[PDB]
């Protein structure tokens, strides 16, 4: 059972999928392949909750209903900047303009 994710740090967004049964640690190995930082230099977050390496994505609240291809769930990523971790920081996306008059009910 696949979950669809945006792994987000600063102005970086990774689009990937993983099994509900796959672990936080295994998702860090996916991130290591792309961004070249090992798991022990990564923190992954659901909102402000730090995720334990042992837990499955399903146990963290990433399900096929809440993590769809067309509406993926966000995983926050922070790197270990020294002996300590940087603060979790995700730059927001831009905002659409006001809805034009002809597109209102």
């Amino acid at each position: 059972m696949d979950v669809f994710l945006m792994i987000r740090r600063h102005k970086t967004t990774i689009f990937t999928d993983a099994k509900e049964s796959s672990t936080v640690f295994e998702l860090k190995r996916i991130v290591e392949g792309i961004l070249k930082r090992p798991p022990d230099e990564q923190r992954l977050y659901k909102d402000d909750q730090l995720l334990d390496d042992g837990k499955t994505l399903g146990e963290c609240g990433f399900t096929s209903q809440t993590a769809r291809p067309q509406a993926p769930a966000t995983v926050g990523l922070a790197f270990r900047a020294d002996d300590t971790f940087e603060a979790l920081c995700i730059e927001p996306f831009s905002s659409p303009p006001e809805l034009p008059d002809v597109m209102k009910p």
Binding site: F4, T13, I14, F15, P69, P96, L99
Partner: protein
Amino acid sequence: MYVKLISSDGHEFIVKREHALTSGTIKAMLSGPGNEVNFREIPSHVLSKVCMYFTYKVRYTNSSTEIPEFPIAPEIALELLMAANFLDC
């Protein structure tokens, strides 16, 4: 095998090459001379939605099962139409 799509406001979207090739424009630019594609006039709220479309297309293409509607909020519909036309996807 990932590629990087960069928005006007400097957001970097890392997507599987197979997903990015959904776009005729991105396919042509990646298959051309001299990997990343930089879009000087497509903002992050639009490009992130385009990447979600790529995920949806690759997941549900040649699927024998019921597929869900691709949802588009009224607020993004006009910008997304213009980007979909521009990107040939």
